[PDB]
Symmetry: D2
Subunit: 213 residues, 4 copies
Amino acid sequence: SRIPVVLLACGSFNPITNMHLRMFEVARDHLHQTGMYQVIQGIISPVNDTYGKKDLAASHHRVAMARLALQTSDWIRVDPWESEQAQWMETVKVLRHHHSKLLAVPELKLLCGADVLKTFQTPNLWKDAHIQEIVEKFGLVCVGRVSHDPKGYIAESPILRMHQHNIHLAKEPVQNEISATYIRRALGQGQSVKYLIPDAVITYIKDHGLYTK
Amino acid sequence: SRIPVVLLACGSFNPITNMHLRMFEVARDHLHQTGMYQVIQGIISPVNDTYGKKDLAASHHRVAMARLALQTSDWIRVDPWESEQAQWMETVKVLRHHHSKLLAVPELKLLCGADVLKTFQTPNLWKDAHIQEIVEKFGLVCVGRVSHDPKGYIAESPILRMHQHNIHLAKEPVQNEISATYIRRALGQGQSVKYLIPDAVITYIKDHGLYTK
Amino acid sequence: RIPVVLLACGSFNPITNMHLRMFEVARDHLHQTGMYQVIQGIISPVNDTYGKKDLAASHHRVAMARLALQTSDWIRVDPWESEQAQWMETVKVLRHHHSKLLRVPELKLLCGADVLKTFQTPNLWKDAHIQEIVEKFGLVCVGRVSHDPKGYIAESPILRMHQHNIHLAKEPVQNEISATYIRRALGQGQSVKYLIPDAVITYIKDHGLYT
Amino acid sequence: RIPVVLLACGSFNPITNMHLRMFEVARDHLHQTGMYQVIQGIISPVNDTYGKKDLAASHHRVAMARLALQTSDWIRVDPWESEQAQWMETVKVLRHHHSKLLRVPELKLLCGADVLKTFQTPNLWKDAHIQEIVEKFGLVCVGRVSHDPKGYIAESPILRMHQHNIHLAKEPVQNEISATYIRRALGQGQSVKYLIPDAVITYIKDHGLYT
């Protein structure tokens, strides 16, 4: 039979969008169609508030919006652990934590866009030891993005290439037109974002006056 | 103050998608931002069952799915009149009907993608008298589509060019990746289409065994 | 390995890098299957009596196509269709070229996925013609943004019956240029360099086209 | 009307039609504003000590850029940056070229909207450099699918303060080719004709690059 799998998505989810959710569904259908995996759960892990140099709605609101957005999902849930930590954590550490939480144990894989795969190649960005542990001890399910050639990223990277069997490229459209950056700008100008992000998230944004300019 | 406007969308809505709904929101924000219109309502008019040579779920189901999809909309509604007619009707006739239904009367405009605008140029497809009445007596709100140059379509067509003030080009992204054709194929192969079309439409499709291969 | 000739119809008003890329993608796709060897490409501009509107004179479009193809060692423009008295249905251009091949390789129509969607347009194509195209000849489809070729095929009672003769070539590069935008840009005095061949841009300027 | 020189940095491994189109769009955009006259374009390939991996030798990338630009009467490749001992930050290449201009026009960095998004990447750019780029020089941004330049600008405390020196040029044509795909395709023996210049394809073949 099949290897049980849990999908983990890291990011700011500022706010979570229809596209971020779409990614899980495409990743799950892809892993199932290989006939050797059974995705048993998805986890949305919003980044903690100390991260980056770009403003984010408070983690409290980002976790709430993800929870509201996931109410109609019977397999994806938001986990606030990462955002509740005192400080920002490297991706590999969130994976270790959730892996330990699962501990004939399911394989925990990082769900991301092909653009994340390109960042591995950025100098001073990732510790090679981290890139390796991620693709070797956990795995990557990358969903395509216009302008990116995941296959080329994999072939040109010695580490990815050696562990490419742990990198699953999901080939199926995934709403690459909506960026959360656009969603925030539209909200700031009083424009509608309905049908781009869940109705329940729009309601929370309105009720709590988020994303105002 | 402003000219009241009703937006009418024709098409098969087989099934209605997040993108079809997105189109109304983008069209409404665009007309409002010109400062001279106030959109008071949107109407989804599914094509009747005698149309075309491509299979469509029965009009009964297409109207039901649109109604379920529009439950969280406070300004767009599905109107079954067109689909309840004995036979297929030309676009201009559906516009005349809904216009008469509104009868200092709001301006009724056809909402469509820029690809419809290209079809006007197709020989033996549209009666010039229809193209003219549509852009002159009613109006068009076109939402962009990749691969199309609406401005060029307008300039190269003598009729559109003469009445171009009645053709509003909404410039704002609109989920041009999802075609209802793709949605149907995915459903037929047992793949997920969640976050591409409304949850309520997916539920109806499942409950009534629609789009099976 | 079966010899294949690819035929592309359209207005080529003007021919663009996308029209050109279309042949290359289609050819690599057919070769990848292993059962075909593409020996020639043919660009056949539509004649002037056609419907549309601002169509540049056929000899101009044929000349631009020839210039765009100077660096191609396997694709050529064939003026026959543009030189006929009046517009002709696609099937008829395919029969003409089939007759020339015999005076043998398989002649296939090359087009974008958008063309497949037009097959459904009521009163636009005769079913008999669609059937002849995929049954007597063949169809090689190059992907285009927003189109789902596989669904077009599955939903057409005619197309799904001839899947062996319909080849879907995926276009991993979103190189979607529309000639309409090319013409409008030229009209506004803007650059289209690197969107269409340099020789075509020079020809256009020399002959005061699309102003 | 202020004279403007556009400077594009990157690996150009190899230069593609998109990199080229980028200059044309940026130039028409700047001229459209009416307050600028673009007098020169400069392609500055990154030197070999750079991070990445499978970078073709700099003289090869500079040679391909030169070949791609033979038909350009306003854009040129400048090997200075690729000839330095080691990699250099972007600001430093801008200072060097500013110094050459003086020995005056405004020197602006030309890049895609994706570059603007990298400004947010923690520990990737120094704020001082981002500030100098948009305050001392300028930034001309060409649109890219999936990117929202206006939001990048509004959300950056540094960028939103220098909006007069940041020019967003819209790319109405989704001509999005990635050099990574170009290299992979060449590696598999597939065609990239009409995606990059013919002379660059010939150069690549002659020198056994990207095999």
